[PDB]
């Protein structure tokens, strides 16, 4: 009964340009068990129309999912990804940084 | 295409 912590990455499909439509991604990987709670946030508020990949896993059996939404980044707007899993002490929030 | 039979443990 192994338990593995999710690795989180919040980034865009294409390099960010203000006022240009792009995709916001939250890639959660290396976790076990498969139950995970992933939300994409815009100014602390949950983004409604978020789609996700089909549950798959790596050679080591750990799961991975990609949560994504169409978005238009601006200077004012603050994007983030909030993740919770049984291995995490508390929900982890990873801010979106266009340089990462 | 998938394995044609079922696996039982």
């Amino acid at each position: 009964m192994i338990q593995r912590t999710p690795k989180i990455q919040v980034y865009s499909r294409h390099p960010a340009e203000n006022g240009k439509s792009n995709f916001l991604n939250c890639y959660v990987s290396g976790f076990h068990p498969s139950d995970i709670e992933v939300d994409l946030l815009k100014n602390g508020e949950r983004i409604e129309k978020v789609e996700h990949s089909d549950l798959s896993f790596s050679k080591d059996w750990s799961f991975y999912l990609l949560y994504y939404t169409e978005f238009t980044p601006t200077e004012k707007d603050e994007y983030a990804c909030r993740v919770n899993h049984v291995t995490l002490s508390q929900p982890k929030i990873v801010k979106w940084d266009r340089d990462m | 295409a998938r394995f044609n039979d079922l696996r039982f443990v």
Binding site: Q3, N25, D99 | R2, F3, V9
Partner: protein, 273 residues
């Protein structure tokens, strides 16, 4: 080496209904099929263009293989609980991973038939495709069953024959996508950290397949201990992304070189800020 893999996941949800069975199929880093037991009308659905031209017969046949294995894995999760002497109360995971790697000769290179219960190796088919590796006391029970039923026969036949022929077919149907590598689009960004240091980030974008090597060197000396190297991540469009960052003293940027290695690149790249 081209490969075909199937990834099955069966999860029990005590008090929240039947265990969920989810399955995905890949040719290299390209998913071509899904199946989710929680879907409205659960069926095998194409996820790549090179399998959506296979007939309704093909898809009805895959759908049936999934529907039956989803019921079987439900039995397997009860069996496994029994083996490990676990309560009705807890959620458990059963995972299957099988497929074939294609060799230069057009024949099988390596066959796979592995399982994990609660994220730990349960029972696997050996490289010889004639025997099993049972990871514990419970898996030894399955192996007794499989040795009597002579299960490896079926598998050896699938992995050597059937698996290889489908991969060869799928590789032909999607040769323009699956057999063409896409080189990474690379650039360097600079982000000051203080008045005396700066982060140099080397980017590799829109590459396929996922396998890549991004390294930073300072005066030709590998900066492996000082490089932040993110995991290769999906862009969401079938291509991948990766970056390697190093914190450099300001004014010393030209002493640093980023090195990219990818199947799609004719020669390895060397980038400087």
């Amino acid at each position: 080496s081209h490969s075909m893999r199937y990834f099955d996941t069966a999860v029990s949800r005590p008090g929240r209904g039947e265990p969920r069975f989810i399955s995905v199929g890949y040719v290299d880093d390209t998913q071509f099929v899904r199946f989710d037991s929680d879907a409205a009308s659960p069926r095998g659905e194409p996820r790549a263009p090179w399998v959506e031209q296979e007939g309704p017969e093909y898809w009805d046949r895959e759908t049936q293989k999934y529907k039956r294995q989803a019921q079987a894995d439900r039995v397997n999760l009860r069996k496994l609980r029994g083996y490990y002497n676990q309560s009705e109360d807890g959620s458990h995971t059963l995972q299957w991973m099988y497929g074939c790697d294609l060799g230069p000769d057009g024949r099988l290179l390596r066959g796979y038939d592995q399982s994990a219960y609660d994220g730990k190796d349960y029972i696997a088919l050996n490289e010889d495709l004639r025997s099993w590796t049972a990871a514990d006391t419970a898996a030894q029970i399955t192996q007794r069953k499989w040795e009597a039923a002579r299960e490896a026969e079926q598998w050896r036949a699938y992995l050597e024959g059937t698996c290889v022929e489908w991969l060869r077919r799928y590789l032909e149907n999607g040769k323009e996508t699956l057999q063409r590598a896409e080189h990474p689009k690379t650039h360097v960004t600079h982000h000051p950290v203080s008045d005396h240091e700066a982060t140099l980030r080397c980017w590799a974008l829109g590459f396929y397949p996922a396998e890549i090597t991004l390294t930073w060197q300072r005066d030709g000396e590998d900066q492996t201990q000082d490089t932040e190297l993110v995991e290769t991540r999906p862009a969401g469009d079938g291509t991948f992304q990766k970056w390697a960052a190093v914190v450099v003293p300001s004014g010393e940027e030209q002493r640093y070189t980023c090195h990219v290695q990818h199947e799609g690149l004719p020669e390895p790249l060397t980038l400087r800020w």
